[PDB]
Structures are given as structure tokens and as C-alpha cells.
Design a protein around this ligand. Sequence first.
Ligand SMILES: Nc1ncnc2c1ncn2[C@@H]1O[C@H](COP(=O)(O)OP(=O)(O)OP(=O)(O)O)[C@@H](O)[C@H]1O
Ligand SMILES: Nc1ncnc2c1ncn2[C@@H]1O[C@H](COP(=O)(O)OP(=O)(O)OP(=O)(O)O)[C@@H](O)[C@H]1O
Ligand SMILES: CCCn1c(=O)[nH]c(=O)c2[nH]cnc21
Ligand SMILES: [Ca+2]
Ligand SMILES: [Zn+2]
Ligand SMILES: [Zn+2]
Lengths: 49, 694, 146, 48
Amino acid sequence: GQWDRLVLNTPSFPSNYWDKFVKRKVLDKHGDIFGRERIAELLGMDLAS
Amino acid sequence: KDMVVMLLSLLEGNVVNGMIARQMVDMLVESSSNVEMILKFFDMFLKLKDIVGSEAFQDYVTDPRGLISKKDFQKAMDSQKQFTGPEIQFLLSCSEADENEMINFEEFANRFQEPARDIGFNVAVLLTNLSEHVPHDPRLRNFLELAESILEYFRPYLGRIEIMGASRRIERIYFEISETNRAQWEMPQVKESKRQFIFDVVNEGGEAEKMELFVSFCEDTIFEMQIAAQISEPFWGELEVQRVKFLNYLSRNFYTLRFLALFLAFAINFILLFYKVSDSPPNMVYYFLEESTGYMEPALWCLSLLHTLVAFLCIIGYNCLKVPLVIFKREKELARKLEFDGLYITEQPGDDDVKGQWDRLVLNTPSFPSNYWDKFVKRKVLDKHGDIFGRERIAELLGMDLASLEITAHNERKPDPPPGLLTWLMSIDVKYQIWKFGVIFTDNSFLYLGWYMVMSLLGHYNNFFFAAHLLDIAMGVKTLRTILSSVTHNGKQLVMTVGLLAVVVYLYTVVAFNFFRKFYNKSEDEDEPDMKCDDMMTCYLFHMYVGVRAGGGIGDEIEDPAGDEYELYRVVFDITFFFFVIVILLAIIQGLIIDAFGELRDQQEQVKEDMETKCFICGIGSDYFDTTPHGFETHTLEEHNLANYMFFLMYLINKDETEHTGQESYVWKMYQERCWDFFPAGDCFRKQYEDQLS
Amino acid sequence: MVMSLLGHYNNFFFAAHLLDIAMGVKTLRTILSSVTHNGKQLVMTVGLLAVVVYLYTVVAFNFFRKFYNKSEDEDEPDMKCDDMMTCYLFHMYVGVRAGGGIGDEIEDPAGDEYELYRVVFDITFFFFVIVILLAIIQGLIIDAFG
Amino acid sequence: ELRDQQEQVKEDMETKCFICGIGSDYFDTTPHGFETHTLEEHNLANYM
Ligand SMILES: Nc1ncnc2c1ncn2[C@@H]1O[C@H](COP(=O)(O)OP(=O)(O)OP(=O)(O)O)[C@@H](O)[C@H]1O
Ligand SMILES: Nc1ncnc2c1ncn2[C@@H]1O[C@H](COP(=O)(O)OP(=O)(O)OP(=O)(O)O)[C@@H](O)[C@H]1O
Ligand SMILES: CCCn1c(=O)[nH]c(=O)c2[nH]cnc21
Ligand SMILES: [Ca+2]
Ligand SMILES: [Zn+2]
Ligand SMILES: [Zn+2]
């Protein structure tokens, strides 16, 4: 669990796993309570893009 | 809350799809709007409590003093998106904003929580009861959906059980569980005790006394919970408070002290490996350390002192932590025997029961119910058995003052003995203390720790006695306990096998002493002969010592019989010795150990299978429940969880009798009478309402 | 791969790759799994064996030193239990490997004031160490099979 | 073999009635049903 923190911010995270949209799904699920910008920083996401 | 209690009382003894429940649902439907308003009140404030702790809110709150402006609060609410605009306006109105429009969100959140918890819990109980007794009603499912947050919040605190009620019908009971009770239950020691109790009742437990054993386990667990609470941390009085602090610290850190003692013993023996013996100092030999550093002797001295100190502290920690449960259990069983069995009134122990004979001392003692709660057991016994066996006689047996019994009832008297050393000495009850000391010295763990302490003290006299404390690794490690238990399991059989081995060797020795003496010379020098079988005792010692240890038997040691008139007799002798003694008897030992392994394994496997296949309470199999998906899991977690029965017992004990409901009073009276018929056996709510539920 | 590369430096490192037969053969994996199943228990049993041998070594170092001379030449004596470390090594090395225990290796106590003490010492060593603890190992393996 | 013989005897006696052969489950449908059956209803000592 500590090691897996590195790959969260990586663009290539869902490289072998099919779901490429899991980051946006998590942002939708937990953005309101935990902050959209904060989730984006955690997951390497560019809110504008 | 009172009105909801009245409604729940109306629902007492309510069958599935009952008229009263359906009319309650109709009333709720008629009052739907106001019910929704109430649920919205509760959910708004519950959600606010978590939102204000949410960090996102902390992002919006910039002000150092912890206050949040009305505008920033509104922005945070809309960001969370869980609230509507009207709800945010209502929250702002309820906020006690100062003239600067600044709000203290902490107090705003904490204000309505505590007042509304009881009503929230009772509303959840009402809705749960109604849902379970009217399973198919969209009008009720809508209310439940509105109350989802409340039910989620109160889920850990809602305990449900099933009993056989006065109506010959299974009834579900809903009650409240305290967070402290749940935490104390979840403590690891309680879990280990639960595992041990389950293993015992499943491997060597009778179904008839299963519920009595379960109730006793619950009582003991409550007592341990009290002990844990007491020891838990948040000029004679000053000395007393530091003393209790020190004792509580020892009790809390008892196991760490045990591990520390083990580590110290290991270090001491590591050092002891370095001794050497020489005639000269560094006719009578000298034992001296050998080290280049030279710092090792004082280290050993210190380690010995610390080990002894830790042993003494472990004694104290045991006496403070675990002895009280021993005394509580012993007092409880004696009280129950007196009240119900009438042991010392009618039956009288057999004189084969040393414990029953020992317990006579404490009957007449004032301090008898010192650790056990019931202080009135003596008067109860006097009422029960006085007429047949004599009130004065019972009073003499139990140390009771018939006159003072009446005065205690007439009014309270205060004979204030201001605290003093002499007053404490008077308070000491010699007979009770002696009985208690006998109990403790009989306790095995106390004996082991005392042996530990004595061996450390002797180690100070001779440092090599510190090696015995390395045997504590057994008790330290569960794996070692299991391995040793494998041997102990068939230990009596092993001793009998050894005795048989001795007997067979004795017979072989007789045969040798009579017919085969010449072959037992163990001397090469012909002038001086050393005959081991010229005497029977020497021959027996020789056989038992060399032959058993040998792989081929005695024939390996004794002289070749080739070219002798008794050659065939001796080869039979030796081969039979080899086969019977070396092969079989040893093989018997190894097979006993192997069988012990399998027996322990199958015990654990059987316990696990019984717990996974059947309910501990009702005994109904997993198949019936699994007819419904996850049915057995739901049954063992919700319907018939034993933890919930324990929590119910605690809840009844804490609750006032006048507040008791009909179900609670029924179960309480049956518990006091020690009747366990209310426990559902062979029946369940599902089975009873099978057709109505579906 | 590393063992092969080291094998190029010294060809004898290629023997380690014969341990791959385990993973190659399912039967070998099952047999080895029988041991691994109770491996922790086996290690604990070995530790207990070491502890008991240590206790016996203490007893010998205190009371039975004279019996631990392993030299026939009287002029030069080789005493294995004049030091505790040497005595422990001697016990763990010879006694366990022996079938009758340490008594097989050390000198006959006949005609000595401590004869009965030593026969108890040797017989108890034999029964507790050689018979039981080993038997515990074999029973653990047997139980793993079942 | 001897161990499993004893265990099987004990399990058979605890699960089924010596007389009727009906299992403990049917009787335990009623609380303490098997105990009542083996002590009162179908006690072999009473037949003797
Ligand atoms: N009446 C019952 N109440 C509770 N559990 C029951 C009951 N009847 C059977 N069980 C079985 O007991 C199991 C309880 O879990 P278990 O004994 O594994 O302990 P635990 O509290 O979950 O934790 P741990 O495994 O750490 O000890 C349930 O999953 C179920 O299999
Ligand atoms: N028809 C039956 N009659 C009596 N016992 C039966 C019958 N069917 C099964 N049993 C089982 O036999 C048990 C009888 O008890 P058990 O065999 O342990 O001997 P006991 O007379 O109680 O005494 P002890 O254990 O000292 O021999 C009953 O508890 C029940 O488990
Ligand atoms: C551990 C003792 C707790 N307890 C109990 O187990 N049963 C009771 O009837 C009672 N009355 C007050 N305390 C009680
Ligand atoms: Ca009342
Ligand atoms: Zn059940
Ligand atoms: Zn029958």
C-alpha cells in the first residue's frame, strides 16, 4: 500500500488494466468531500484538459 | 423519545403483518410530511458533523481563530453538494453567527448531536422493527431510504437478538449497545477468551450446560472489562494514588514484563556460555569469565538484578490483574451451590473435594462476597433454607447476626471509622485472607511465577540457576505450547509404556542372570574381570542403560556367542530383545506423539466446522439459512450473535428495573432464576414466520 | 541466472541449478510442501532441542567435567567440557548425532560416586532428545502428509 | 483405528437414539429434545 502511492500520479497507471477512466470516476465519487483539486494532485490529473 | 417508547411497547409481542404494526404504518403515512421533516433534521445535522471535520471544509476556513463566515460556509456547503439551498439557509439560521457574521462550526455541529441521539436511536429501532415485521411495504421502504444515514450511524449501536417469549413464540428484541462496551469486547484479550471458550464448549461441552457456560463466560468477561476500565489511564493519599498508578501500570504491561524477563534470561545465559574452569586463579577449581572487554561481569550482575526485579513485578502484576477473576469465579460458584444446590446445607461435600472442604472457611467470613457482586446471597440462602435447616443454624454457618439483619433494613447506620493503620488492621479478615491465599497458591500460573522468582533468587547465589528461566519460552510461544501438548496429551500412556519397557528388561535380566552370566564380562584384561550380571541389580542397570540406548540391543555390547552350546538360545534372546524393546516400544512412543498431533488437528478442524455449519445458539444448520442468500452470515451476525446476547445482559444490568420492558423483565427474571429457556433452541424468527415472510 | 554466471567463474556453481528439479516436478513440490507446511514448528522444535542440550551442558560443566576427556594419551588431555562453549558444541555435535546419546561418547562412569546421577543424565538425554524431539519432527512430517 | 472407533461410538450415541435410530436434529427441533428422548421416551434402561 505504501509502494502503490508512486503510481497514482503517473499518467501510465492503467497501462495493463482496461479501465483508463478510473481516475475520473474517483474524482466524481470523492471530489466533493475531499476536494477536486486535491484528488487531481493525488492522481496526476489536469482539470482543464 | 417517550412517545416512541410507547409505540414500541404497543409493538410488544407483534407478529409479522400484525394489525397494530400495519396501523402504525398507516399513521406514519398520514404523518409522512412531518416524519420526513424530522428525518431531514437528523440527517442534516449528522452530515454537518462529518462535513465540519472534513478537510475540504478546513480548506475554506481561512481564519486562524477557527471561525467561518456565512458566505464561506455557504460556498463549502454547495461544494459538498449534499445540501440544498434551503437546507443551507436553515443551517445558517441555526448558526449563532456573531455580528461579524462569523460562526463557530465546532459548537454548531456539536450542539444538536447529544440531545438527539436517544430519539434518533429509538426512531431507527422503530423503523427497523416495522420493516422486519412488515417486509413488503413501499411506504415503509421510502421512510427507510430517508432514514438511511441515521440507520448507518446507529448500526453498530443497535443490538438485536431473538428469544422464546412468554407467548411460546420467537420474538426479536432491539436494544442499545454502548461504544465502551463494544470497544472492550473488541479488545484482543476478550477475543482470545472467546476463542478459548468456544473451543472448550465445542470439544468437551455438553449441550445441556452450554447456555449456563455461556452465561458464566459473559459474567467473567464483564468482570474483566471492569478490571480493564479500572487499570486504564485517562501525603498518605498521595502515596496511595502513586501506588495504584504503579500497580495499574504493572497490570497493563504485565506481558511486556514477561517478555523482558525472557530476554534477560537469554542474555544472561549467552554470557554464561563464556565461563571457564581452572585450577589456578585468574586444588579447588575456579570458575572465571573469559572476555577481552572485561565489562561483562558487571553487566551480568545488573542483568541478574533486573531479572529478579522483573520476576517480582510480574508476581505483583498477576496478583493485581488475574487473581480477581479467580476469586470472583470461586465465590460465584460457591454462592450458586449454596443457593440452588444447598451444598453445605443439605448435600455436604464428599470429602474427596478438597476445594469444597477448603471453601468452608469463608462461609462465616464477613468479606465472603468481596469480588462477587451479590452481597445479599447470605440472606437469600437464609430465606431459602432457614425453615427446614434452621435460621439460627444458617446464621452460625454464614456468620450472620439475625438482629442486625433487621436494623440494616430499618435504617442506615454510619459507624464512621476515620482511616487509620489500626482500623485497617481491624478491617483485615484473617480467615478470608487465608482462604484466598490457599486459592492463589493452588493457581498454577502463580506457582510458575513463584518458581521463576525463586530460581532467580537462587541464581544470585549461583548464576547457573538462571538457565531454568529459558524454559519460559514454552509459555511464551504458542507453537511450543502446542508441540509440548502433543507429548502431554498421551503422557500417562507414555509413562505406562516406559514401565512396561522396564518390566520386559527385568525379565530379560532374569534370563541373563540365570543362563547367560558368562557373556557379560566388560573387561579386556583377563586377570581382572568386570562381570555386569553377577548381581541382579547390576545386570538390570546394565540392560536398562546400555541395551536400550544401543541400536542392535544388548547383543551389541555383550560377547559373541559363536561356538557355544547356548548360541541359539542367545541369538533368540538378543533378536527378541531388539524387536520387542528397540523397535516396538519406541515405535509405540513415536506413534503416540503422532496420534496426539492428529487428535489436536482434528479438534481444531471440528471446532471450526461446527462454528461454520451451525449457529452457536440455536444449533440450526447452515443449509436452512443459506436457503436465503448469505442467510447463515446474517443469522450469526444479526439474528443470533452471541456478542449481542452478552451486550443485552450488560444492558439489563445497567438499566433500571422500572424502565425494563416486558421482554427485558422476562429475560431478567429468568436470568436471576438461572433458567435458560429464553434462549432459542431449534427455532428462529425465520422458521417461525417462514410462510408469512414468504 | 546469477548462479550460471558465477558458474562460468567456477564451474561447480552449476550444481545449484539441480535444485530446479523441485519446481520442475509436481511430486517434489508436494514432498517439499510437506516439510514447509510445519516448518515454523520444526524450527521451534530445533530451538527447544538446543535449549535442552544447553541445560544438559550446564549440568555436565558443573558436575561431570572429568568424564569429558577425548584423549587416549594421558600426558596430553583433551577436555571438551572445561569451557561451556566447547561443551555445548560437543553436546550438540556428537550427542544428537549418536543413537545412544552423549553417554556413548563420554567415559564409562562405572565405579564412581556419581554413577547413578550420570546414568540418569544419559538416559534422560537419550529419551528426551533422541527419541521424542526427533519423533516430533517425524510426526510433524507425517501429519503434513495427511 | 482404535481412536476413531471410540470417537465413532461416541458420535453415534450422541447423534442418534440407540432404539429408534432417529437423528438428534429432529428431536432438537424441540429444545433438549434428544436428551428427553434418550432419558424418558427411549431409555434402554427402562426397556430392561
Ligand atoms: N451465534 C453465532 N454468533 C457469532 N458467530 C457465530 C455464531 N454461530 C456461528 N458463528 C461463526 O463464528 C464466526 C465468528 O468469527 P470468528 O470466530 O472467526 O471470529 P472473529 O470475531 O470474526 O475474529 P477472529 O477470527 O480474529 O477471532 C462467524 O463467522 C460464524 O462463522
Ligand atoms: N436410547 C438411549 N438411551 C440412553 N442413552 C442414549 C440413548 N440413545 C443415545 N444415548 C446416549 O447415551 C448417553 C448415556 O450416557 P453415557 O453413555 O455417557 O453413560 P452414563 O450412564 O450417563 O454414565 P457414564 O458416562 O459414567 O458411563 C445419553 O446421554 C445419550 O447421549
Ligand atoms: C460482573 C458482575 C455483573 N453482574 C452480573 O453478571 N449479574 C447480576 O445480576 C448483577 N447485578 C449487578 N451486577 C451484576
Ligand atoms: Ca415502568
Ligand atoms: Zn441461531
Ligand atoms: Zn429412540
